[PDB]
Structure formats: C-alpha cells, structure tokens
Design a protein around this ligand. Structure first.
Ligand SMILES: CCCCCCCCO[C@@H]1O[C@H](CO)[C@@H](O)[C@H](O)[C@H]1O
Ligand SMILES: CCCCCCCCO[C@@H]1O[C@H](CO)[C@@H](O)[C@H](O)[C@H]1O
Ligand SMILES: CCCCCCCCO[C@@H]1O[C@H](CO)[C@@H](O)[C@H](O)[C@H]1O
Ligand SMILES: CCCCCCCCO[C@@H]1O[C@H](CO)[C@@H](O)[C@H](O)[C@H]1O
Ligand SMILES: CCCCCCCCO[C@@H]1O[C@H](CO)[C@@H](O)[C@H](O)[C@H]1O
Ligand SMILES: CC(C)C[C@H](N)C(=O)O
Ligand SMILES: [Cl-]
Ligand code: NA
Ligand code: NA
Length: 509
C-alpha cells in the first residue's frame, strides 16, 4: 500500500484537503447571513465540541483501516463492527464524496474559467457610480458562463468555453491523482499550499487598503468580529455554525479517513490532526473572512453587504468581488489572483474527494491505480452533465450529500467507532503513536457531548427545516433525487461484488 513520504507533505495534503472553496466562498456568506459576530460564537464552540473530536476520530479510523489494506468506510465500518449493516452504512462513505465531487469539480472549473478570462482581460467593462450599472455587467458575465435560465424551463445552457474548461479541470485533477499519494497529491500539496497562502495574504492586504464614502475594510472586520449574544438561542445559527464546521474540515465526507489510511500504522495522528485542523481555521477565519466581507462592507456598507450575502452563495465570490475589484487600478489582475486562488483551493480539495472512490477500486476491487483513476473520472465527468444542464440540480446534491449526508455520516462513524467498536479501544487507537496525547476531557466530549450535540441538531433539522424542501421545491428535483439514489445502489452493488471476490479469494487461498 501507498504511504505519505514526509510528515510535512501529509500535513499539507490534509490542510489542502480541508482548505477549499468553502473557506473563501461559503464561510463569508454564512457568517454574514447569520449576523457576523453572532455566528462566530457558535462557530468557535462547534469547532471545539464537534470539529476537533471528529477530525481525530476519522484520522484514527483511517490509519486503522489503512494498516490492514483498506482505506474506505464500507471496508473499515465492517472492521469496527462485523455486521452486514456496517458495509451498507459504509457506502455513504463513497456516496457522499462522489456526489459532492460531481458538483464541486464543476464549480472549481468556473474559477479556472474566470481566472483565465481575467488574466486575458476578457471581462465586462462597467461604465465609469451607480452600483447597479456596475454590478449588472458581472451578473451577466456569470449568467452567460454557466448559462442561467432565461425563461420558464429549468435548463442550464453552459457556454462552450465553460464546458471545455470543465474538461481541462477534470484533466488537471486526473494528472495529479494518477501519480498517487506521494508522487501526486503530496508533491502537489507542497507547491499548492504555499502558493495559496501567498495569494491570499496579498489579497487580504490589498483589500485592507480599500476605502470609500461607504466605509473601510475595517468595518467589515468589526461586523465579523462583534459578538451578538441575542442569537445564541437561534437554532438556525447553531445549525449554521455546525454545518459550516463539517464542510470546512471535510468531516463526514470520508476524505479525511481515506487520506489518513495512507498514514503508517505507527505515525502520530494526534498532533497532525490538530495541526491540519488549525491550518484550516486560520485560512478560514483569518484569510477567507478578511477578503469577501471587508471589501463588500467597504464599498457598500454593512446593510448592503448582508443583503448581498443573502442574495446567493456565488453572488459575492463570482459577481460582487470582481465588480468591486474592477473599480480599482489593475483590478482585473486582482480578479485573476482572486480566481487563481480559488482554483488552487478547489483543486486541492477535489483531488481529495475523488480519492475515496479510487482507493476503493484499488483496495477492494483490486484495479490498478491507473484504471481506478480513469473510471472515477468517467463517473464524475459523465454525471456532472446533470449538474451542468439541470438548474438547481447542484443545490439538491449539496443538500443530500453536502449538507444532510455529512452530519448523519459523522454521527454514524462516531457511533460505530466510539460506541460499537468500543469507546476505550477507540481512545487507545486515537492516542496510539501520538507525539502529544488527547486532553482527557475530550474523551467525554467524544463519547457523550458530541453525539448528543449532533443528534439534537439532526432532530431539529428533520422537523423545522427538511419538510419545506421535500414539498415546496420544483418537480425537477426528482430527477437529481432519482439519479443520486441511483448512484447509491450502484455503489451498493460494487460493495457486493467486492465482498464476493473476497469470498472467492479466501477460498482460493
Ligand atoms: C458522455 C456524456 C455526454 C452526454 C451529452 C453531451 C453534451 C455536450 O454538449 C456540448 O456542451 C456545450 C455546453 O452548453 C456546448 O457548448 C456544445 O455546443 C455542446 O456540443
Ligand atoms: C484555455 C483555452 C480555452 C479556449 C476555448 C475556446 C472556446 C470557444 O468558444 C467560442 O469562442 C468565441 C470567442 O471567444 C465566441 O465568439 C463563441 O461564441 C464561442 O462559442
Ligand atoms: C440530465 C442531464 C443530461 C445532460 C445532457 C445534455 C445534452 C446537451 O444538449 C445540447 O447542448 C447544447 C448546449 O446547451 C445545445 O446547443 C444543443 O441544442 C443540445 O442538443
Ligand atoms: C435534465 C437535464 C438535461 C438538460 C438538457 C438541455 C438541452 C435542451 O435542448 C433541447 O433538446 C431537444 C431534444 O433533442 C430539442 O428538440 C431542442 O431543440 C433543444 O432546445
Ligand atoms: C469542552 C472542550 C474543551 C477543550 C480544551 C482542552 C484543553 C486542554 O486541557 C488541559 O489538558 C490536560 C490533559 O487532559 C490537563 O492536564 C489539563 O488540566 C488541562 O488544562
Ligand atoms: C468537500 C470538501 C473537500 C470541502 C472542503 N472542506 C472545503 O471547505 O471546500
Ligand atoms: Cl469555515
Ligand atoms: Na483545497
Ligand atoms: Na475548509
């Protein structure tokens, strides 16, 4: 089996795994929609009560599984719980990263696409003061690119350039993943990460220098870092904060697990898991949070920033922020740095969410790494046409695999590892090989607090939120719903073939 070559590569591969588009696109929207400083409180607690503990658990499962030649959850879930239902529950660990991959890679490609058009200076030319005459040319720039519907039909019509950049993007993902852990994901993570850090620093600095009749970047920082204890009681704020902790630290995607399974059996995972998590939360709160919001608040003042955040998720990153940059000298280049930064951030995270399925085709179905990568690209590339041409298809997947799936799977891997497998055997397994050990208090946060926190979350969710989505959506949602349910049975079928081949291989030995 393959292993990470250096302690550094591993840590940067894991930090690039987590540090993605969620840090620079999702976090900003989420923190502003949810009252700025009023979101930061739950977010910090959630990081201490859910974030860190699950990070460790997944590394643990990962290294544990990897040692015995398995890097995915259908296998590993069976090793922790010798039951047929563990393989099935373990499927979600290939399903989630696959579905998410299907729409992540596409979005990631956009940034490449925009990155290229801003470099070359093929970008809208806003008429040099009216906020709309400026924002509109860019709304149309995005709307043309991805192909937003103009009439009554839920049909996206992607530009050709977009489509072909989606090919290159796939190609670029494959060229890394096909070289493997150490010579691919690892070699790349050592270049990407520093680059990502520099670009973001440069942007953060340049943004801090923004001033307008309407404010300064400072006002954005205040808005973001001013406590509002009159929300703490809002369950929407806690479901917001926790949903953001998961996505950002790649928990419940089975990606941490799969990566971790390339960690040598003896290698520490306590100081490593802790370093990777702490990297993702700096990049998140220090960098991601100091680019979008400050710039928006500095040009529009807070009241309008918030209104934009709520407008959509991509309004800020793909429309507002470029439009703002366009009102500054070389703001086109700056735009390119902005998108070139996003790209690398989405590239390092998309290679991560595609490795689970790969690791399964090699591990369980004994395919070469090459065929594994190729087929995994074909499944994602084919399926991505759904996302490309079906309006709000992305939104549906991001909900079932990227929102509901992750939380349910997180609680699930926690209940299998710490409750079924064994709390003590889990503790012993997490701490084993550590450079540092785990704060004794955390044992009790993992065994009682965490699972009760989440369990409650999911309960409120299934009551005060999910009924609206099942009933108040358009009818096309049932196409994607049909498709991603179809993917699950397919995965369920390979898990079936894999256990069969194993039976034939045990008999033939
Ligand atoms: C392998 C599965 C293929 C199924 C259908 C392929 C559709 C390709 O369609 C292409 O996409 C672009 C985006 O709008 C357009 O620019 C092109 O004119 C079009 O040929
Ligand atoms: C990284 C390289 C990507 C290049 C792919 C070219 C995409 C083809 O796109 C075409 O180009 C023209 C001009 O820009 C437009 O007039 C056409 O409407 C468009 O279909
Ligand atoms: C459920 C998802 C199905 C994806 C199949 C999409 C097939 C591509 O469809 C084609 O693409 C072009 C661009 O919009 C159009 O010019 C063509 O008229 C259309 O035939
Ligand atoms: C479910 C997602 C799939 C979206 C595909 C959108 C493509 C729209 O393409 C349409 O297809 C028809 C059938 O060949 C043609 O008769 C139409 O002229 C054409 O506009
Ligand atoms: C509710 C979760 C809070 C997490 C913060 C934990 C900080 C570490 O806590 C420390 O770790 C040591 C080992 O267990 C103890 O010896 C110390 O008394 C303690 O101060
Ligand atoms: C699906 C994961 C790779 C997402 C990643 N943690 C991000 O914040 O973008
Ligand atoms: Cl985050
Ligand atoms: Na990333
Ligand atoms: Na992240």
């Amino acid at each position: 089996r393959e292993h990470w070559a250096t302690r550094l590569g591993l840590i940067l591969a894991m930090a690039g795994n987590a540090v993605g588009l969620g840090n620079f696109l999702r976090f900003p929207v989420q923190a502003a929609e949810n009252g700025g400083g009023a979101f930061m409180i739950p977010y910090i607690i959630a990081f201490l009560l859910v974030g860190i503990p699950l990070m460790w658990i997944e590394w643990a499962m990962g290294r544990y599984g990897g040692a015995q030649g398995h890097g995915t959850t259908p296998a590993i879930f069976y090793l922790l719980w010798r039951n047929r239902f563990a393989k099935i529950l373990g499927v979600f660990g290939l399903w989630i990263p696959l579905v998410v991959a299907i729409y992540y890679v596409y979005i990631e490609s956009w940034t490449l696409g925009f990155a290229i058009k801003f470099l070359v200076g093929l970008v809208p030319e806003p008429p040099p003061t009216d906020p709309d005459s400026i924002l509109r040319p860019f709304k149309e720039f995005l709307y043309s690119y991805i192909g937003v519907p103009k009439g009554d039909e839920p049909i996206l019509k992607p530009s050709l350039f977009a489509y072909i950049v989606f090919l290159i993007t796939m190609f670029i993902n494959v060229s890394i993943l096909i070289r493997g852990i150490s010579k691919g994901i690892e070699r790349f993570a050592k270049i990407a990460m520093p680059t990502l850090f520099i670009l973001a620093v440069f942007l953060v600095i340049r943004v801090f220098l923004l001033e307008t009749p309407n404010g300064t970047a400072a006002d954005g920082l205040n808005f973001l870092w001013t406590p509002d204890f009159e929300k703490l009681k809002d369950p929407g704020v806690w479901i917001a904060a926790v949903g953001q902790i998961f996505f950002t630290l790649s928990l419940g995607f089975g990606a941490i697990i799969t990566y971790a399974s390339y960690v040598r059996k003896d290698q520490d995972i306590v100081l490593s898991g802790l370093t990777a998590a702490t990297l993702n939360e700096k990049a998140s709160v220090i960098l991601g949070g100091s680019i979008s919001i400050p710039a928006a608040v500095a040009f529009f003042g807070v009241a309008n920033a918030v209104a934009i955040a709520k407008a959509g998720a991509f309004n800020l990153g793909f429309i507002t922020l470029p439009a703002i940059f366009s009102q500054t000298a070389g703001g086109t280049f700056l735009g390119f740095l902005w998108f070139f930064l996003l790209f690398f951030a989405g590239l390092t995270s998309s290679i991560a969410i595609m490795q689970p399925m790969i690791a399964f085709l090699e591990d369980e179905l004994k395919l070469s790494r090459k065929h594994a990568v190729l087929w995994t690209a074909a499944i994602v590339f084919f399926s991505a046409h759904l996302v490309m041409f079906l309006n709000k298809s992305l939104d549906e997947m991001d909900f079932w695999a990227g929102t509901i799936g992750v939380v349910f799977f997180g609680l699930t891997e926690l209940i299998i590892f710490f409750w079924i497998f064994g709390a003590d055997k889990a503790w012993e397994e997490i701490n084993r090989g550590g450079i540092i050990k785990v704060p004794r208090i955390y044992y009790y946060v993992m065994r009682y607090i965490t699972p009760a926190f989440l369990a409650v979350l999911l309960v409120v969710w299934a009551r005060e939120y999910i009924p609206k989505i099942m009933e108040e959506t358009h009818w096309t949602v049932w196409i994607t719903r049909f498709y991603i349910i179809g993917l699950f049975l397919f995965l369920t079928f390979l898990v079936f073939l894999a256990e069969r081949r194993r039976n034939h291989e045990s008999a033939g030995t």
